[PDB]
């Protein structure tokens, strides 16, 4: 809205209460919108007997299509916005402005790939709270979207040439961060919950679990092609993202479930570990949806006025 002349402001995308606010809002959105037939949540406080909370409820088959949310200043506060395209998300920003509201953000719940989001305006950007810590998630922001077309018939398609181009740019940014002499390797998820190990998302109100091995199986700066086809599974028994628990939904009713999304970013983790080897391994990650919100909110902060 209006630029602040000669003003330097510190941003920290990893400690941003806008992220926490958005998170609670999406959890509430899902309560009123995507209701399971049965949901289970653990309760073990007595230290001698557990009592799982079980809720059974009406379970309507409904279309689910995320629409943009705009966050405007909460009472007593103001929203500041960092204008530097390449801003890492943590540190001083010299080009800051005040805005009435954020840009429109679609609250897509997904793992591994970030979908239907904003693209970087210059080069590919990577962000972490601590790059040296192998346990911390790396948020990648692409500067060019990649289409992924999915069907309820059990697969997602991605153009192989575009994906390769994308991987090359990511690896080049990763070696820029971890060493120019490093070989960059992408591998499949090392394990965990199904929602974590596959690229997991919802389409037509159904939960898709697609095998992403073919997307993360290459080596960079070391020395059926046209389309990559990922096998998918639609499931009814789902681990909850909102909190520890499980939900069960009814089977699909539509024989024509079709979605096409733009991949605009990804979530990766680095293997790390003690090694004199001159290579780094990166695997798809995600699961904490706050990282999804961060990927869009990194350039904003709210300040007391």
């Amino acid at each position: 809205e209006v630029v602040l002349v000669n003003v330097t402001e510190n941003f920290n995308m990893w400690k941003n209460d806008m992220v926490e606010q958005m998170h609670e809002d999406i959890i509430s959105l899902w309560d009123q919108s995507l209701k399971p037939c049965v949901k289970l949540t653990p309760l073990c406080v007595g230290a001698g007997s557990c009592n799982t909370s079980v809720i059974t409820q009406a379970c309507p088959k409904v279309s689910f299509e995320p629409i943009p949310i705009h966050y405007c200043a909460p009472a007593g506060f103001a929203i500041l916005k960092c204008n530097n395209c390449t801003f890492n998300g943590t540190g001083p920003c010299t080009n800051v402005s005040t805005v009435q509201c954020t840009h429109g953000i679609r609250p897509v719940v997904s793992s591994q790939l970030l979908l239907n989001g904003s693209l970087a305006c210059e080069e590919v950007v990577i962000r972490s709270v601590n790059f040296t810590d192998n346990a911390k998630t790396i948020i990648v922001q692409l500067n060019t979207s990649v289409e992924i077309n999915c069907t309820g018939a059990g697969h997602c398609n991605i153009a192989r040439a575009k994906w390769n181009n994308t991987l090359k740019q990511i690896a080049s940014k990763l070696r820029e961060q971890f060493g120019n002499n490093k070989t960059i390797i992408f591998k499949q998820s090392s394990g965990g919950d199904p929602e974590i190990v596959t690229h997991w998302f919802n389409c037509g109100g159904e939960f898709f679990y697609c095998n992403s091995t073919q997307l993360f199986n290459s080596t960079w700066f070391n020395s059926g092609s046209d389309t990559i086809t990922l096998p998918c599974r639609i499931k009814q028994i789902i681990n909850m993202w909102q909190k520890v628990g499980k939900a069960m939904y009814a089977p699909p009713i539509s024989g024509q479930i079709r979605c096409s999304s733009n991949i605009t970013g990804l979530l990766l983790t680095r293997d790390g570990g003690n090694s004199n080897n001159e290579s780094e391994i990166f695997r798809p990650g995600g699961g904490d949806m706050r990282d999804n919100w961060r990927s869009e909110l990194y350039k904003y902060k709210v300040v007391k006025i």
Partner: antibody
Amino acid sequence: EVQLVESGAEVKKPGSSVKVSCKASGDTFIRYSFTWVRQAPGQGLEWMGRIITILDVAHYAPHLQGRVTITADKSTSTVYLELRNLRSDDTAVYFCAGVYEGEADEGEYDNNGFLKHWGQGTLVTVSS
Amino acid sequence: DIVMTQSPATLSVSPGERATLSCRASESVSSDLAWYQQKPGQAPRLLIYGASTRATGVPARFSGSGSGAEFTLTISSLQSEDFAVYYCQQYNNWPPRYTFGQGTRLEIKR
């Protein structure tokens, strides 16, 4: 396909409780849901309740809520029905039944309400 | 609760002829409707589920029809082993409160 073998006949006084069992063999236990259906002498079938085995969650007929419990023991592939505060009108043959639900261990679940496999029935007589 | 009504209570059919059984629901149950056969002293046997799908091991002379609130079981040519009691079962509701019809007894007309 599962084979369902039920426990033997029971004779109870009114006010007592009973616990009948049903051993499922031949297929993967957690891929099935199990239902209990009763039939009083000369009468029709009455749905009692059904357990979603993988979730360990059971639902019951309204007229029975409170005094019926359905459980499953995954380690022994056995399904149990308990009926408390027995009345003479609880006299019936009690049937355990089940149906395949899909690859439940892989999150697939059709939630089928029909009943493909049936036990041989257990007579429970409730009388003074 | 959903009430299932079968008619007639007893059906008398001459060997080798066609039998038609009816099941009505007190409200729509879509296609969540099953048919069972029961002989004296034995457990019920599933014949049809989803209103019209034949269960494994069920011969083709058994066919189910209908949707919503009215359903039919047709047996195209009665064999000796087809004489029994037939039950319909509603399983449409959630939370589940499944219900049975009171049965139709199919007996031999002589």
